[PDB]
Design a protein around this ligand. Sequence first.
Ligand code: CLA
Ligand code: CLA
Ligand code: CLA
Ligand SMILES: CCCCCCCCCCCCO[C@H]1O[C@H](CO)[C@@H](O[C@H]2O[C@H](CO)[C@@H](O)[C@H](O)[C@H]2O)[C@H](O)[C@H]1O
Ligand SMILES: CC1=C(C/C=C(\C)CCC[C@H](C)CCC[C@H](C)CCCC(C)C)C(=O)c2ccccc2C1=O
Lengths: 741, 51, 144, 74, 164, 80, 144
Amino acid sequence: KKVKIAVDRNPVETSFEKWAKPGHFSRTLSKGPNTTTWIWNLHADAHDFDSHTSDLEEISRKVFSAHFGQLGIIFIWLSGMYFHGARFSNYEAWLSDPTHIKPSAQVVWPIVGQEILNGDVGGGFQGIQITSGFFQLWRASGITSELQLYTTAIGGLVMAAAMFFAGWFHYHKAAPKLEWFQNVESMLNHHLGGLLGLGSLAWAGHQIHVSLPVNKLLDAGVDPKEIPLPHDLLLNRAIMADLYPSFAKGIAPFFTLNWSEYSDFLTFKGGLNPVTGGLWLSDTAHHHVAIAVLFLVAGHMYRTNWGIGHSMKEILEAHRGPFTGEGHVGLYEILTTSWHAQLAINLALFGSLSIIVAHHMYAMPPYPYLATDYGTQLSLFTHHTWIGGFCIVGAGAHAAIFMVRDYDPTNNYNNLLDRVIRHRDAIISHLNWVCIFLGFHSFGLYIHNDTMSALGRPQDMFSDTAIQLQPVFAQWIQNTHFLAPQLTAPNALAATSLTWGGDLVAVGGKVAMMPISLGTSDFMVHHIHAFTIHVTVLILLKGVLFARSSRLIPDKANLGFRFPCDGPGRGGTCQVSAWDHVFLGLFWMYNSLSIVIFHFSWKMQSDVWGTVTASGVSHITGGNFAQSANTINGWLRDFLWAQSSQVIQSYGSALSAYGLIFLGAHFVWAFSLMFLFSGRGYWQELIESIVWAHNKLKVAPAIQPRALSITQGRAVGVAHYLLGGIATTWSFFLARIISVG
Amino acid sequence: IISRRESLRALVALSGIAAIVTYGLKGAKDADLPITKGPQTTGENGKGGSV
Amino acid sequence: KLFPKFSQGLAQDPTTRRIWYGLAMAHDFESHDGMTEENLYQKIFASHFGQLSIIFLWTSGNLFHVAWQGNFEQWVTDPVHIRPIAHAIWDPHFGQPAVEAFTRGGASGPVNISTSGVYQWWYTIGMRTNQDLYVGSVFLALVS
Amino acid sequence: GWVTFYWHWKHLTLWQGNVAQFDESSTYLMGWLRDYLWLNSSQLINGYNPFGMNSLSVWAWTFLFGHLIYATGF
Amino acid sequence: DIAGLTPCSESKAYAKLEKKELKTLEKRLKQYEADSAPAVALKATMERTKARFANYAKAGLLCGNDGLPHLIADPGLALKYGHAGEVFIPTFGFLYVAGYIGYVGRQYLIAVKGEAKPTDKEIIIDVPLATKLAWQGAGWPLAAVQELQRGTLLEKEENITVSP
Amino acid sequence: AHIVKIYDTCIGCTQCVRACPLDVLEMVPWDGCKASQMASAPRTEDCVGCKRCETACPTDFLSVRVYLGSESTRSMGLSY
Amino acid sequence: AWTVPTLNPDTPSPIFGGSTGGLLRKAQTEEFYVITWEAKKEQIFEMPTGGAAIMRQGPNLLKFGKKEQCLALTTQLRNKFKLTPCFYRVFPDGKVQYLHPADGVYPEKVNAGRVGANQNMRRIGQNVNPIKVKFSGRMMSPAE
Ligand code: CLA
Ligand code: CLA
Ligand code: CLA
Ligand SMILES: CCCCCCCCCCCCO[C@H]1O[C@H](CO)[C@@H](O[C@H]2O[C@H](CO)[C@@H](O)[C@H](O)[C@H]2O)[C@H](O)[C@H]1O
Ligand SMILES: CC1=C(C/C=C(\C)CCC[C@H](C)CCC[C@H](C)CCCC(C)C)C(=O)c2ccccc2C1=O
């Protein structure tokens, strides 16, 4: 059996002896400090497992049990939210009136006057109005009681200690060998089939047998203490046949292939559930069934111990063409003896999945009473774009680390990876052009509209009453996908969302989802998005391809991944390393994603969100997006100034914490400019002047004060730039959208 | 007319002469330059609000 | 090769920072090539004439555009409600709403309200008529 | 910038007449933000809009022009 | 009434703002049953609030044009008019604790340099040593001014310089 | 043409020469050290001034020393 | 025994399909630097201009546009593979100049017969003040 369990018994003694000696992992740190750069290099090099040792087996065991540590912390984090969902919440009261009672699950302690953050969220309850949307998960899960939240919180603590056991066991007691990890055929067969396939089979079975009969009784209208408990929905088939009359046929229509007889509770409805605003749950049930059958089929693709199935070395080495030399030869060997090469491809798509998730959830809101909660909708979009955006920059960072550390010029000869480096000047320069092309022809349209509107020439702007730049292609797709149930998807009862066209869903006198009409302001801002992503690509891909060498510095890989510079010579070589390109890319990721979440938070408030009266529905900001997003001054006036009037005068209320962090993150943002502008050799000399006054009063420390390193003072700078930048928009968005929505 | 460098330097400069010295009087189009118009209705009010 | 006449070490520079450092250390007289201390003080002393001749040409410019395009003779009589005028506007990029929105202060064409406040300084040192302001402009233009 | 924020805003509240609107709000930094920068930039940023424009549009344009040179400095 | 001021027990914008806050709490209190803990919490907020106004007027805090407690940070105008508790008492209540933390941290660094490698005992704080200096540093001004008289507080020009 | 001038505090451990990415430095005999050698810079026409030499000198207040002078097409590190 | 080897361009290049990081128009006007080594066996090195080239047995001729691009090639040819290369400097009038083992022995080891230029028989802390070297024709460091 080439695919087999292979571990090593007791590699590391479970002992506190190495906790006594910090910096024990590295040669350069184990000799103790003499300098405050020791304790920063301790935390910097702590999880740099490739730099501790050279053994790939010892690296692999370290990242395998650290992943149990991250999963074990997520299980604490989930079990916190079910516990704070249970003991300090209004989820009992929220289910009876989920239109007026604001979701709240954080309650503060009345000490310094901070009990004013316990707002009047309704439901006989005081607490911080949450926006993470767990109450919409739980109605979609059919929880209906705070007993169920408490039992799955205890189930979360149990699972977290099991995950902490597992990382302890699979590192200290019985840790795997190297060729266990290098069975990537067996890993994908198990993860596509068992994790993704059987997971969505199991969750569909939760949706068939628990969530569908509970949420059918909630939509038909039953108080949640009167609904049958979901174990009674298992043991009694006669209850299920009352709601969906095809459970009386049992599981006979499945094996007799009479699957059309399951049409009551596996549907293809589409659109939205008009009672609750969310997606249809029977639609999501047939979703996760058909997802599961797809992944279990795809989970039997790769060859492990019997000759059937594909082998990824042969799949890669066969796809070779006349333009690319050897083709994909040698990519299997570098995606199996390098974690950073795995981590780059993983963080790319997993970050790109998060932005797929964010865009597919305002438009197709999967949870009951999710869409009318405008606070949850704004946060669940905004969060999952940022979490995507960091992970995409992490793809650029750890691809560069592959090029510096784990790249092998020997085994990479005239494959794709060798030929990308050999025309890396053509790659960056044609990308340099299209960023400059997108720079003028997207942002200069805004400067044109600023100038024409300031010069009293509104007929010469780029707007709808002026030179019209319509998004012809995206308006064409909305005319097709709304007409898709006509003949291209004839079994759909409605469209796949309501952005494509049609009518709105009114739930509780508020718009769940209405159609989105794209205009010239939507044209300009989508090309702003194309601009900022191509520049973010430009910086990160320059760091990947010029990680090893350039015409500037030929021996750059010998200097490593994270170095400051090569000195002031040849004009200056500040920020030439591949660390420094993923330093600069974080600002453009910040610059790209801020305009994404600004274009979300103002298109929805102008053209989607708002109260409906069946009398000419009014939106939140009155319908002023295409009227005003032509100009930078429109983004200044109508978005950053008009909508800031709920974060600046929110004092004396529960939203006053958002007013503090609005000033708090305006501080921390600007605090970063002390680090982003200045440099070390100033601050080291200033320390010498104050070590002098500490020498004079005999309080000279033994761990000697040094200024922060060159790369560290940059890394402190971009960390406080992003923390002060994002938490500004966090508190701006939430203090806006909790009040007006 | 012009074939060398200093002949072309004269012709570009004299063509810049011939446009601009006319543009102030004959070349200010009725639709292009609203400053070269007549004094229209109002505008000469105080700066607003208070003093 | 010729533009930094002061620094021949910049004249041997084949790159484009030759232009940038020809500008920025052109007034760093202590580091020019062949500079002596008698040659140092003479270029500083003539440059102070260059600063003075700019200031008086600048101030004679303020006296001219107020005397010609300003409303100083109208502002003398009512110095509270009439707003001051710096210099009239000729921007051919304007539109017609941007002509009539900048006509203010009782003037004919578009104007700029002078916030520098040289009317209040001139009104209290005896200036009353525009003919007293042209004479001051021609005087400083001679002195410049 | 700190001496001129304090000069201007104590003089705005003096010249408007609401001399107590400073002393209530100058004691804490939100009143610097929502009563001096937010409140007094109402007619500035309205120098040009899609409704029209007025005499403040040359100072409205420069106010965005100043933010542009500033950020180009970073 | 020291510098254009007034006692907060005597001003009326102070009492107007007290009645402003209790108005906001009571119109927030009205949404709940009289047994409910979201109303028990708000009535406990009021009795912390109303005692707070009673205690600020009890201490004789100075209000002004805005009806807020204004502080007088000058001895001779606080000692004379009975306001040393505003600034002049906590300016020594602080500077006891401040130089306490300084002296304990001083004595820990002085008594660690005579060792094998003192940099190790700035990571790993000798807790039986550090707590011992923590308790016995409680008379630190009595110990510092005796060290101030010797010349052992100030190290001489053994200190490190660049180019004098 | 950058100005590289070294000093008598050299000990001749020749780490500056091995660190120089442009062969500016070489090792000349000199009796003022145990290793009987002191560096020399006969090729400062080729120097960029990237200061990899004086990142590598062990001696306090570095023995090798680079003064950034006037930049030719070799000092700016140009393939063009 | 050693003196000044010459060049023939007949010697074969490494097998490399060409990169865009190679020479530029500076090679046709100013200078370009060629590098030679004698390889024992056929193996795969990294080009300093990005990519990977394979060396062949015998002499190997390669050309670059910088001096660091050649010495960052010998650095991985001497430390990794224990070869002994040497690179030259070719001018577009055909003139060639010998550069790296300029007296045969590599510059980390003493040749006892190379001349100690650019040295100060004094300590770096014993420089003069810039007031003494002021007005030295051009701007001048006190370390001269
Ligand atoms: C799957 C996720 C993942 C994983 C496993 C890694 C793993 C690694 N990364 Mg990596 N990275 C990721 C995502 C990931 N990264 C992303 C998303 C980015 C883009 C932001 C980067 C950018 C990046 C860079 C630029 C570098 C690494 C480095 C490293 C290595 C060592 C990290 C270390 O020891 O730091 C230990 C952990 C810390 C020092 C903590 C950092 C403190 C953060 C910045 C503060 C923020 C915390 C919180 C959000 C703020 C609120 C806290 C509150 C108290 C205020 C290790 C291989 C380094 C490396 O390989 O060096 C050669 C390196 O230089 N990564
Ligand atoms: C069908 C079997 C199966 C399943 C379900 C998984 C599941 C998982 N593997 Mg995995 N793996 C498998 C087979 C399987 N593996 C095989 C055969 C190999 C060898 C080729 C590996 C090698 C491997 C590596 C190297 C890594 C994983 C990781 C992961 C986790 C992904 C993290 C995530 O997305 O959260 C999903 C989380 C959940 C679904 C929560 C449920 C967790 C369950 C209870 C544990 C997984 C089931 C377990 C494999 C069955 C054995 C039970 C145990 C008692 C013996 C996830 C728990 C990564 C990880 O997180 O490390 C810990 C990781 O680094 N796997
Ligand atoms: C608002 C501030 C600002 C501006 C304008 C720029 C501008 C630019 N950056 Mg940039 N940058 C900034 C802040 C800014 N940056 C910050 C804060 C950082 C820190 C991390 C960076 C980091 C950064 C990197 C890392 C990169 C850029 C890049 C670019 C260029 C791409 C855009 C382009 O070509 O469009 C064209 C220019 C504009 C749209 C500016 C407005 C000009 C208008 C439209 C017309 C021009 C006026 C006209 C000619 C009239 C002239 C009058 C006459 C008298 C002269 C461009 C030069 C990328 C680059 O150079 O490659 C493409 C790149 O790689 N920048
Ligand atoms: C993990 C293994 C995968 C398979 C999943 C098994 C999960 C365990 C579920 C056990 C719960 C009991 O499930 C099962 O109980 C009863 C006994 O047939 C069935 O109940 C049915 O059968 C009884 C006798 O036949 C009658 O009262 C009715 O026909 C009807 O109530 C339920 O339709 C079914 O839900
Ligand atoms: C301010 C600044 C510094 C100075 C920052 C100093 C060195 C560090 C800031 C304080 C550190 C975090 C020490 C404070 C906490 C210590 C652990 C001591 C704790 C003692 C009590 C507070 C518990 C730099 O070193 C620097 C370097 C490069 C570019 C820019 C800069 C820069 O802008």
